[PDB]
Write a structure and sequence with these properties.
The PDB classes it as transcription, transferase/dna. Keywords: Reverse Transcription, Time-resolved, HIV-1, Cryo-EM, transcription, TRANSFERASE-DNA complex. It forms a trimeric assembly. The complex is a heterodimer of chains A (540) and B (403). In chain A, 29% of the residues lie in helices and 23% in strands. Chain A has 13 helices and 26 strands. Chain A has a five-stranded mixed beta sheet with strand order 17-16-15-19-20, with helices on one face. Chain A has a five-stranded mixed beta sheet with strand order 23-22-21-24-26. In chain A, strands 9-10-11-14 form a four-stranded antiparallel beta sheet, with no helix packed on it. In chain A, helix 11 (472-486) runs parallel beside helix 13. Chain A is elongated, with a radius of gyration of 32 Å. The longest helix of chain B has 20 residues, at 149-168. Chain B is an alpha+beta fold. In chain B, a hairpin with a 2-residue loop joins strand 7 and strand 8. Chain B is globular. The chains are: A alpha+beta (540), B alpha+beta (403). At the A-B interface, helix 4, strand 7, helix 9, helix 10 and helix 12 of A face helix 1, helix 8, strand 10, helix 11 and helix 12 of B. Residues 63, 70, 72, 108, 110-113, 149-150, 182-183, 218 of chain A line the site of 2'-deoxyadenosine 5'-triphosphate. The structure holds one DNA strand of 38 nucleotides.
Chain lengths: 540, 403
Amino acid sequence: SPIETVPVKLKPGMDGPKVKQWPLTEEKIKALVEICTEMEKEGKISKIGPENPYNTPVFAIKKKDSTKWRKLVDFRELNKRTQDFWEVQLGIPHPAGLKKKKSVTVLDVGDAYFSVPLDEDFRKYTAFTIPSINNETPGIRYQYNVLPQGWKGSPAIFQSSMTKILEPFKKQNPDIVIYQYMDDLYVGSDLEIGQHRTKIEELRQHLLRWGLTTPDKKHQKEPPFLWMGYELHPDKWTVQPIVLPEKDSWTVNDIQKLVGKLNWASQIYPGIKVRQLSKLLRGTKALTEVIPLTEEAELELAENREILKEPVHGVYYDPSKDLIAEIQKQGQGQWTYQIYQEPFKNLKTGKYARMRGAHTNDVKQLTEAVQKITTESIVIWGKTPKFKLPIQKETWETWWTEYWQATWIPEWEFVNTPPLVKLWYQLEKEPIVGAETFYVDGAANRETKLGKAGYVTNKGRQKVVPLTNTTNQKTELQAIYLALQDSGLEVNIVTNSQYALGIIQAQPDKSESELVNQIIEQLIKKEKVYLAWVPAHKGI
Amino acid sequence: TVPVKLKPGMDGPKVKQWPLTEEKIKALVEICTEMEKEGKISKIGPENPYNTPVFAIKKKDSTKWRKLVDFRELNKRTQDFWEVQLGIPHPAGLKKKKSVTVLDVGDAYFSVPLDEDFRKYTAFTIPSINNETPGIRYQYNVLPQGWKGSPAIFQSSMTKILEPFKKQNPDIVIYQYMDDLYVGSDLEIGQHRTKIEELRQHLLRWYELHPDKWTVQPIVLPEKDSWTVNDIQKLVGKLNWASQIYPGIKVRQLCKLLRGTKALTEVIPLTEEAELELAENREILKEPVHGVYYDPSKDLIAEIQKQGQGQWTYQIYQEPFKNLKTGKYARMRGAHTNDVKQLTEAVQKITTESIVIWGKTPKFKLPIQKETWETWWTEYWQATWIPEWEFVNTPPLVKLWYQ
DNA sequence: TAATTCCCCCCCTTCGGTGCTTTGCACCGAAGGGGGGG
Ligand SMILES: Nc1ncnc2c1ncn2[C@H]1C[C@H](O)[C@@H](COP(=O)(O)OP(=O)(O)OP(=O)(O)O)O1
């Protein structure tokens, strides 16, 4: 290709790699010999002599289409010693962000990296040795004249070169949409099929003038188009078929693969849940360790299989309509959402199950889900959608007016989906008249890990319990728990703990600590609770 | 060109580009196409390893988009403020001036080329909607707006331009920060506008503040004719917290009134000793804390607290419990349900005040979740500078003690 | 051990660093696994 090379240098004070080639299978050696002979015929690699002291191990893998080998170089040392690059690939295109096009073509550039020349001064660092069949003769030594597969600079250089090659054609054809992901090209237009094919041939000729071939084997002309892991139809898109493993006994690696596949499926299949399956991966050590299902991962797996049984599709973006994201709660800090423009015509689906913080409530998790959906929607469509949330306007108003943080949700409306989001208790702003007043105290020593937790009541009642392996914070939480347990429906509580008061004032409904969970249950059980903080031992 | 250099031991900015809305991306693409047409920026490849985030804003009552580059990492590097004379020693009369107008003069920076060896540090990437194409990388060929070194390099030309104006009007204090000129006069507001028009025409041929109304926010104890145990407990906590700001605060009698377990609603009469102590603490709180001086070496920290009902409090300090300034930003609600917009406006106002008073933007401790801020702050930002900020993940200890 | 590569986005778990202080506890980012793309 006549494209100008990108100048590349090593990191300062660094030399080229000198890693010895490891032994290779005779099949791999034969495949590499054939590939290297073909490449040297085409000038993609050049024979080198003793003047080159560098070496890097090479190997081969199988391509997606078998009977063809991909030649890779273990450039880890060279990658360590290579200058840093800035990646221009900022993300992954999504079919939901595609607009409807009358005519569509998917093109792939052949031998992509090997069609882009490499900087000459860097070429000596790409030296490698193709070992001899079985052994005997010393191997043939080559160096790369093009972008090698396995070098950390090849993807960015190829992407920039492809952008430079494509820019004149896109300038001359502003009405043609071209999604370029590395070498994969999606070309959409509103032209007639004959005019579209003429434009496609023009684009192929333009690419060929730059040394980029577009072989017919990967030239797709009819729907459905296999693009970027999706199947694209004229009016809908789906994911390429997802095969969930069906194993009698599961290992850690199997569970990880299943969770990843379910996460991938959740972008268009609504209701995917992975929490119970992800919990199986907590505390495990060996990837081959057999993990039995916990009868909660069994139900989750059955539900996910039921969801995947029916085929679902997404629709294409219509910029003249409105984006609407609807959120539903699923329990245990899990949320699903659907982004659509017409009812029951999903552009996209997704889930949010991140557990941020030791103590949270449903409102904070809903806000986090809204933030995630907003960022994803800005990425895909360039705008934020209107939200349909299962939270009352009054509940959100109370929360964000009484909360000490700056919280906001973009333009949204309430949807009465039965699992509504609400705060399960409220702390009184003023002490309750006539309610019993508890003064709680929890102390612990840092040496013996022993402490006490108790309360004194203005009516004369008092109690104190000892605690072992408990810190001061745990003792204060225990003292508040004691006050909650021994009180009536209404209670005033005075604590010296800023930590416990700060935890409780956030109004959590779930926590990673069982003590906080018990406190939350007691608080929900109560009718009126006032929490007061007193500074220190100065006075009760 | 001035041979700008990075700080010794520093590498260069490598900050990723955050996603942008479609209108922002279109505005950025148009602006960058125009800038590349006139040689202000040039396209670069991925072999440049540096990057700074970029976005677009719409100024106050302006229909034109302005490109903004987040040069905060590069500004933390780039010791250029000494090699080229930094912005003149901060005038102390700007804070005492009557009317201060902020003018955008960053466009002039585009008239002076940037040192070639430094250009690679000004790299930025325009993103694409739905990742249709790889991000388009540019680097600056001229002095960029938002970089700390641009005013330092342009200071010679700035003084040359302003000299015919400063000599004619010696009563006007002109300060320069980033792309902004803060020009202050004690004249009448109509004469101030006329003189501003003359200065604008001077700049062409070559937003008003009021620092006099900036009032401190003292901590005030509540006044009651009958104090309950809860009220005395809250007062004692407030005074115990204030004792770290005002040495000499006594709570002995008030704490003596809080011995023996009693109902929070119970009304306890105040003893004469407690009453005197409360009066003495109130008059101690009335006078401002003495012994706090701005140290130009140390950095400014601005803490913000949300008080509800569209009210925020802030404290600018260099050492804990030693406040250089305390204030309250009130939006009085008024069809303003957006907490993030209010916090962004408060941050901009506090930064403007800090620039006017000490010549430095403070480091903000924002009372917001990080993701919410990074998602929404660019939608309401109007300033051409960006202060450093961090996010507090714990409820403030002060709470209502700053009211 | 046995197979050894690169770049991008995502999720879920683990672990170490940071900050305030009640030297424990909460939060966050990077790296490991997985998914997907080329
Ligand atoms: N496993 C991989 N390791 C390293 N680089 C890869 C890998 N897969 C793809 N790439 C890079 C290098 C390829 O030249 C480029 C495009 O991928 P791909 O289309 O699969 O291959 P190709 O262009 O070399 O082959 P083909 O001619 O068969 O299309 O992306």
